[PDB]
Amino acid sequence: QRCGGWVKLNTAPVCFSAKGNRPGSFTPSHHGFLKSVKLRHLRGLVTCQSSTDAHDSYWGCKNRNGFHNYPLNVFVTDKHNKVMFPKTGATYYLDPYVIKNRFYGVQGYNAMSPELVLQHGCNSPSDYIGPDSQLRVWYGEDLYNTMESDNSGKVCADVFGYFV
Amino acid sequence: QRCGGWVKLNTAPVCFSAKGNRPGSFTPSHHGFLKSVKLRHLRGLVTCQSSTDAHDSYWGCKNRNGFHNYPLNVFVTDKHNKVMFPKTGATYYLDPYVIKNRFYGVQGYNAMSPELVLQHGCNSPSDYIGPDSQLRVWYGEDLYNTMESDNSGKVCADVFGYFV
Ligand SMILES: OC[C@H]1O[C@@H](O[C@H]2[C@H](O)[C@@H](O)[C@H](O)O[C@@H]2CO)[C@H](O)[C@@H](O)[C@H]1O
Ligand SMILES: OC[C@H]1O[C@@H](O[C@H]2[C@H](O)[C@@H](O)[C@H](O)O[C@@H]2CO)[C@H](O)[C@@H](O)[C@H]1O
Ligand SMILES: [Ca+2]
Ligand SMILES: [Ca+2]
Ligand SMILES: [Ca+2]
Ligand SMILES: [Ca+2]
């Protein structure tokens, strides 16, 4: 029902944990093709290493190890856990120890950004958001089952979209 | 860029006449969903009343009768002659004598604009431009079979798209 945006897609807060296959899953209120989403932090912190508070963040694992420049670790998928955001604008940390974990950065944002904008890139037919779609906000280490056991926290957010 | 810049959709110039069911037809070189197209005049002129060269234009019928301010009459359709551009941003001339002819204006452009940008509005599934698609650049009086017999000319253009 909406062209452009931002338009709020969620009803209730969308809340994700950092382990245990616990994404924040919801049925979007509006249909169409999305250019991007904007995640607006409401409450909570997650971390990829619970032995310290140093990495606690909205969207990832801040100031961690050797990759302070790849602090993000949130992915918005469809109901099949296929990533829809980000698909552009993100650079990934590629060291083999944690390549599969998919830590990333987006220039202009960090893991403490009050609002995080993630780009879809251009659309293909199967990217349509319809009545049957579900979006899932995942922590990457949870999604990929990489080193999740030492994670903790829970973040709640609103999710806005921009339709094209 | 392929996703984000003007992308040339045609190869050879796209040439349309103003009568005789003679749109300029082509299969786009790139697939996906468009926000807009840009038509770039290359050569030729068309008119909606051939008794003089007064109205000869790139995109319509310039300085004609009652509708100097609605001089445009080009439409980009799919292979079933369904209009895809413009679908927003166009103001139609509604005088009963020529309402069906679908003369229109777009702010900041006229029928001699070297380039004309036409907006699609937001996309639905059936707006996909794929390998089976054919885009057609029509003269409106020819598309709608309204007062076409006194038309003449042929315009050739390049056609660019903005993918989303
Ligand atoms: O290197 C970044 C990586 O650290 C993981 O934690 C390691 C921890 O540092 C190490 O002492 C322990 O032996 O193994 C842990 C992994 O099982 C974090 O879990 C991971 O999220 C990354 O941040
Ligand atoms: O009124 C705009 C309309 O004019 C049509 O031409 C008229 C013409 O002016 C009239 O003298 C003739 O006898 O009837 C024509 C229509 O069949 C143009 O063809 C049309 O394109 C409009 O520009
Ligand atoms: Ca971890
Ligand atoms: Ca998991
Ligand atoms: Ca005519
Ligand atoms: Ca015709």
mmCIF file of all heavy atoms in Angstrom, chain A residues 74-101:
data_model
loop_
_atom_site.group_PDB
_atom_site.id
_atom_site.type_symbol
_atom_site.label_atom_id
_atom_site.label_comp_id
_atom_site.label_asym_id
_atom_site.label_seq_id
_atom_site.Cartn_x
_atom_site.Cartn_y
_atom_site.Cartn_z
ATOM 1 N N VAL A 74 24.252 -8.282 12.042
ATOM 2 C CA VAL A 74 22.799 -8.474 11.930
ATOM 3 C C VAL A 74 22.501 -8.690 10.451
ATOM 4 O O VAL A 74 22.970 -7.989 9.543
ATOM 5 C CB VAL A 74 22.033 -7.256 12.519
ATOM 6 C CG1 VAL A 74 22.165 -5.951 11.738
ATOM 7 C CG2 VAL A 74 20.553 -7.525 12.670
ATOM 8 N N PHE A 75 21.559 -9.656 10.196
ATOM 9 C CA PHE A 75 21.152 -9.940 8.841
ATOM 10 C C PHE A 75 19.628 -10.063 8.829
ATOM 11 O O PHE A 75 19.056 -10.731 9.733
ATOM 12 C CB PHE A 75 21.728 -11.295 8.364
ATOM 13 C CG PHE A 75 23.232 -11.212 8.237
ATOM 14 C CD1 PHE A 75 24.024 -11.569 9.295
ATOM 15 C CD2 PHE A 75 23.833 -10.694 7.094
ATOM 16 C CE1 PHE A 75 25.415 -11.384 9.234
ATOM 17 C CE2 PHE A 75 25.221 -10.518 7.039
ATOM 18 C CZ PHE A 75 25.995 -10.866 8.098
ATOM 19 N N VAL A 76 19.005 -9.439 7.852
ATOM 20 C CA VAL A 76 17.525 -9.599 7.711
ATOM 21 C C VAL A 76 17.306 -10.559 6.557
ATOM 22 O O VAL A 76 17.708 -10.332 5.411
ATOM 23 C CB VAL A 76 16.870 -8.235 7.454
ATOM 24 C CG1 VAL A 76 15.362 -8.410 7.356
ATOM 25 C CG2 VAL A 76 17.234 -7.218 8.558
ATOM 26 N N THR A 77 16.678 -11.720 6.894
ATOM 27 C CA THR A 77 16.429 -12.800 5.931
ATOM 28 C C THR A 77 14.914 -12.917 5.645
ATOM 29 O O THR A 77 14.089 -12.362 6.322
ATOM 30 C CB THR A 77 16.951 -14.144 6.445
ATOM 31 O OG1 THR A 77 16.126 -14.637 7.510
ATOM 32 C CG2 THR A 77 18.374 -14.044 6.965
ATOM 33 N N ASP A 78 14.647 -13.697 4.594
ATOM 34 C CA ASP A 78 13.298 -14.214 4.372
ATOM 35 C C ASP A 78 13.043 -15.385 5.324
ATOM 36 O O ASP A 78 13.825 -15.774 6.166
ATOM 37 C CB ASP A 78 13.103 -14.533 2.910
ATOM 38 C CG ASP A 78 13.925 -15.707 2.398
ATOM 39 O OD1 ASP A 78 14.487 -16.433 3.180
ATOM 40 O OD2 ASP A 78 13.922 -15.838 1.168
ATOM 41 N N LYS A 79 11.865 -16.046 5.065
ATOM 42 C CA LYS A 79 11.431 -17.171 5.968
ATOM 43 C C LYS A 79 12.235 -18.455 5.716
ATOM 44 O O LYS A 79 12.035 -19.462 6.433
ATOM 45 C CB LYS A 79 9.937 -17.422 5.736
ATOM 46 C CG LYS A 79 9.615 -18.185 4.450
ATOM 47 C CD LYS A 79 8.186 -18.721 4.428
ATOM 48 C CE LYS A 79 7.177 -17.654 4.486
ATOM 49 N NZ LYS A 79 5.821 -18.209 4.384
ATOM 50 N N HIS A 80 13.111 -18.426 4.714
ATOM 51 C CA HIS A 80 14.007 -19.524 4.388
ATOM 52 C C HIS A 80 15.437 -19.242 4.823
ATOM 53 O O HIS A 80 16.372 -19.946 4.450
ATOM 54 C CB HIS A 80 13.979 -19.850 2.895
ATOM 55 C CG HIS A 80 12.569 -20.064 2.464
ATOM 56 N ND1 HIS A 80 11.850 -21.174 2.897
ATOM 57 C CD2 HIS A 80 11.770 -19.333 1.669
ATOM 58 C CE1 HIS A 80 10.675 -21.028 2.334
ATOM 59 N NE2 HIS A 80 10.571 -19.934 1.601
ATOM 60 N N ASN A 81 15.619 -18.152 5.617
ATOM 61 C CA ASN A 81 16.924 -17.732 6.137
ATOM 62 C C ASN A 81 17.862 -17.297 5.005
ATOM 63 O O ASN A 81 19.090 -17.263 5.246
ATOM 64 C CB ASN A 81 17.511 -18.800 7.058
ATOM 65 C CG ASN A 81 16.620 -19.043 8.246
ATOM 66 O OD1 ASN A 81 15.938 -18.121 8.725
ATOM 67 N ND2 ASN A 81 16.596 -20.296 8.736
ATOM 68 N N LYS A 82 17.337 -16.892 3.865
ATOM 69 C CA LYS A 82 18.142 -16.313 2.795
ATOM 70 C C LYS A 82 18.277 -14.803 3.055
ATOM 71 O O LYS A 82 17.277 -14.102 3.252
ATOM 72 C CB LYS A 82 17.487 -16.522 1.430
ATOM 73 C CG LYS A 82 18.122 -15.840 0.230
ATOM 74 C CD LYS A 82 17.380 -16.003 -1.115
ATOM 75 C CE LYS A 82 18.266 -15.386 -2.202
ATOM 76 N NZ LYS A 82 17.590 -15.313 -3.521
ATOM 77 N N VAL A 83 19.517 -14.307 3.041
ATOM 78 C CA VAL A 83 19.754 -12.881 3.415
ATOM 79 C C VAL A 83 19.136 -11.978 2.363
ATOM 80 O O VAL A 83 19.435 -12.131 1.184
ATOM 81 C CB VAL A 83 21.244 -12.618 3.580
ATOM 82 C CG1 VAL A 83 21.487 -11.117 3.808
ATOM 83 C CG2 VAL A 83 21.776 -13.417 4.735
ATOM 84 N N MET A 84 18.361 -10.987 2.801
ATOM 85 C CA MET A 84 17.845 -9.954 1.898
ATOM 86 C C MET A 84 18.523 -8.591 2.185
ATOM 87 O O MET A 84 18.563 -7.748 1.319
ATOM 88 C CB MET A 84 16.336 -9.819 2.038
ATOM 89 C CG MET A 84 15.627 -11.119 1.513
ATOM 90 S SD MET A 84 13.862 -10.959 1.463
ATOM 91 C CE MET A 84 13.638 -9.894 0.033
ATOM 92 N N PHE A 85 18.976 -8.385 3.424
ATOM 93 C CA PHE A 85 19.645 -7.063 3.804
ATOM 94 C C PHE A 85 20.704 -7.432 4.822
ATOM 95 O O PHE A 85 20.467 -8.159 5.783
ATOM 96 C CB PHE A 85 18.631 -6.122 4.485
ATOM 97 C CG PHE A 85 17.313 -5.933 3.762
ATOM 98 C CD1 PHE A 85 16.309 -6.876 3.908
ATOM 99 C CD2 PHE A 85 17.078 -4.866 2.911
ATOM 100 C CE1 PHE A 85 15.112 -6.766 3.236
ATOM 101 C CE2 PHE A 85 15.864 -4.764 2.243
ATOM 102 C CZ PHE A 85 14.899 -5.730 2.381
ATOM 103 N N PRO A 86 21.920 -6.878 4.665
ATOM 104 C CA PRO A 86 22.422 -6.158 3.501
ATOM 105 C C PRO A 86 22.782 -7.114 2.375
ATOM 106 O O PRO A 86 23.250 -8.241 2.646
ATOM 107 C CB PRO A 86 23.688 -5.434 4.006
ATOM 108 C CG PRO A 86 24.238 -6.427 5.010
ATOM 109 C CD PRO A 86 23.001 -7.079 5.631
ATOM 110 N N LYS A 87 22.685 -6.652 1.127
ATOM 111 C CA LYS A 87 23.299 -7.322 -0.021
ATOM 112 C C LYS A 87 24.261 -6.402 -0.786
ATOM 113 O O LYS A 87 24.963 -6.870 -1.635
ATOM 114 C CB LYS A 87 22.263 -7.864 -0.990
ATOM 115 C CG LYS A 87 21.452 -9.013 -0.448
ATOM 116 C CD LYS A 87 20.367 -9.478 -1.388
ATOM 117 C CE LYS A 87 20.894 -10.266 -2.555
ATOM 118 N NZ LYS A 87 19.861 -10.407 -3.606
ATOM 119 N N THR A 88 24.288 -5.106 -0.451
ATOM 120 C CA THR A 88 25.235 -4.160 -0.966
ATOM 121 C C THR A 88 25.590 -3.239 0.182
ATOM 122 O O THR A 88 24.892 -3.175 1.186
ATOM 123 C CB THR A 88 24.727 -3.349 -2.163
ATOM 124 O OG1 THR A 88 23.711 -2.472 -1.681
ATOM 125 C CG2 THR A 88 24.223 -4.215 -3.297
ATOM 126 N N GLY A 89 26.732 -2.530 0.012
ATOM 127 C CA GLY A 89 27.186 -1.583 1.007
ATOM 128 C C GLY A 89 28.007 -2.154 2.146
ATOM 129 O O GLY A 89 28.562 -1.403 2.971
ATOM 130 N N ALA A 90 28.095 -3.480 2.227
ATOM 131 C CA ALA A 90 28.763 -4.173 3.309
ATOM 132 C C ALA A 90 30.111 -4.746 2.838
ATOM 133 O O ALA A 90 30.176 -5.305 1.750
ATOM 134 C CB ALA A 90 27.930 -5.280 3.816
ATOM 135 N N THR A 91 31.147 -4.548 3.648
ATOM 136 C CA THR A 91 32.417 -5.257 3.463
ATOM 137 C C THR A 91 32.587 -6.197 4.655
ATOM 138 O O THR A 91 32.235 -5.853 5.792
ATOM 139 C CB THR A 91 33.600 -4.270 3.286
ATOM 140 O OG1 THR A 91 33.643 -3.366 4.409
ATOM 141 C CG2 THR A 91 33.606 -3.469 1.990
ATOM 142 N N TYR A 92 33.153 -7.381 4.387
ATOM 143 C CA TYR A 92 33.158 -8.480 5.357
ATOM 144 C C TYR A 92 34.576 -8.794 5.816
ATOM 145 O O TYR A 92 35.539 -8.677 5.033
ATOM 146 C CB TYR A 92 32.552 -9.749 4.759
ATOM 147 C CG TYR A 92 31.095 -9.591 4.448
ATOM 148 C CD1 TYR A 92 30.646 -9.026 3.267
ATOM 149 C CD2 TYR A 92 30.150 -9.949 5.383
ATOM 150 C CE1 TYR A 92 29.293 -8.789 3.023
ATOM 151 C CE2 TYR A 92 28.803 -9.682 5.170
ATOM 152 C CZ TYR A 92 28.377 -9.117 3.984
ATOM 153 O OH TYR A 92 27.029 -8.875 3.753
ATOM 154 N N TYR A 93 34.716 -9.214 7.076
ATOM 155 C CA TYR A 93 36.023 -9.626 7.576
ATOM 156 C C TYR A 93 36.281 -11.057 7.120
ATOM 157 O O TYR A 93 35.455 -11.950 7.348
ATOM 158 C CB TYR A 93 36.032 -9.511 9.093
ATOM 159 C CG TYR A 93 37.349 -9.799 9.754
ATOM 160 C CD1 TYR A 93 38.515 -9.151 9.413
ATOM 161 C CD2 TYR A 93 37.377 -10.758 10.737
ATOM 162 C CE1 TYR A 93 39.714 -9.460 10.064
ATOM 163 C CE2 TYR A 93 38.552 -11.089 11.392
ATOM 164 C CZ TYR A 93 39.704 -10.416 11.076
ATOM 165 O OH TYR A 93 40.879 -10.750 11.714
ATOM 166 N N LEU A 94 37.444 -11.289 6.483
ATOM 167 C CA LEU A 94 37.673 -12.533 5.749
ATOM 168 C C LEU A 94 38.751 -13.408 6.362
ATOM 169 O O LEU A 94 39.104 -14.437 5.789
ATOM 170 C CB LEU A 94 38.003 -12.260 4.287
ATOM 171 C CG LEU A 94 37.029 -11.328 3.563
ATOM 172 C CD1 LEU A 94 37.429 -11.110 2.139
ATOM 173 C CD2 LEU A 94 35.610 -11.892 3.597
ATOM 174 N N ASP A 95 39.240 -13.076 7.540
ATOM 175 C CA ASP A 95 40.192 -13.979 8.172
ATOM 176 C C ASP A 95 39.607 -15.367 8.377
ATOM 177 O O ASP A 95 38.490 -15.480 8.880
ATOM 178 C CB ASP A 95 40.614 -13.416 9.511
ATOM 179 C CG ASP A 95 41.754 -14.278 10.042
ATOM 180 O OD1 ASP A 95 42.881 -14.213 9.493
ATOM 181 O OD2 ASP A 95 41.477 -15.127 10.886
ATOM 182 N N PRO A 96 40.291 -16.481 7.988
ATOM 183 C CA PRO A 96 39.665 -17.797 8.061
ATOM 184 C C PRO A 96 39.130 -18.154 9.456
ATOM 185 O O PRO A 96 38.212 -18.910 9.513
ATOM 186 C CB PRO A 96 40.773 -18.725 7.535
ATOM 187 C CG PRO A 96 41.557 -17.875 6.574
ATOM 188 C CD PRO A 96 41.582 -16.525 7.273
ATOM 189 N N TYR A 97 39.694 -17.632 10.545
ATOM 190 C CA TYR A 97 39.193 -18.007 11.890
ATOM 191 C C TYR A 97 37.704 -17.687 12.040
ATOM 192 O O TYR A 97 36.969 -18.440 12.706
ATOM 193 C CB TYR A 97 40.022 -17.353 12.997
ATOM 194 C CG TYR A 97 39.670 -17.756 14.411
ATOM 195 C CD1 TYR A 97 39.771 -19.066 14.848
ATOM 196 C CD2 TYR A 97 39.237 -16.807 15.322
ATOM 197 C CE1 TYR A 97 39.465 -19.406 16.157
ATOM 198 C CE2 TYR A 97 38.944 -17.121 16.631
ATOM 199 C CZ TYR A 97 39.054 -18.431 17.052
ATOM 200 O OH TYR A 97 38.729 -18.781 18.340
ATOM 201 N N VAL A 98 37.256 -16.578 11.448
ATOM 202 C CA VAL A 98 35.901 -16.135 11.605
ATOM 203 C C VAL A 98 35.222 -15.749 10.304
ATOM 204 O O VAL A 98 34.179 -15.081 10.349
ATOM 205 C CB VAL A 98 35.768 -14.997 12.622
ATOM 206 C CG1 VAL A 98 36.030 -15.479 14.036
ATOM 207 C CG2 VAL A 98 36.663 -13.820 12.279
ATOM 208 N N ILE A 99 35.718 -16.210 9.158
ATOM 209 C CA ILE A 99 35.105 -15.845 7.893
ATOM 210 C C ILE A 99 33.620 -16.238 7.856
ATOM 211 O O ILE A 99 32.775 -15.496 7.351
ATOM 212 C CB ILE A 99 35.899 -16.378 6.675
ATOM 213 C CG1 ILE A 99 35.342 -15.787 5.386
ATOM 214 C CG2 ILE A 99 35.986 -17.902 6.625
ATOM 215 C CD1 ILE A 99 36.185 -16.134 4.183
ATOM 216 N N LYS A 100 33.302 -17.429 8.339
ATOM 217 C CA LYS A 100 31.951 -17.907 8.262
ATOM 218 C C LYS A 100 30.968 -17.135 9.149
ATOM 219 O O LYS A 100 29.772 -17.135 8.912
ATOM 220 C CB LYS A 100 31.917 -19.375 8.645
ATOM 221 C CG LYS A 100 32.402 -20.286 7.537
ATOM 222 C CD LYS A 100 32.138 -21.732 7.874
ATOM 223 C CE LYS A 100 32.476 -22.092 9.313
ATOM 224 N NZ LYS A 100 33.941 -22.129 9.586
ATOM 225 N N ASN A 101 31.495 -16.447 10.160
ATOM 226 C CA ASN A 101 30.695 -15.671 11.074
ATOM 227 C C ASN A 101 30.078 -14.437 10.414
ATOM 228 O O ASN A 101 29.073 -13.909 10.904
ATOM 229 C CB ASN A 101 31.528 -15.235 12.292
ATOM 230 C CG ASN A 101 32.258 -16.310 13.064
ATOM 231 O OD1 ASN A 101 32.328 -16.285 14.307
ATOM 232 N ND2 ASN A 101 32.882 -17.193 12.360
#
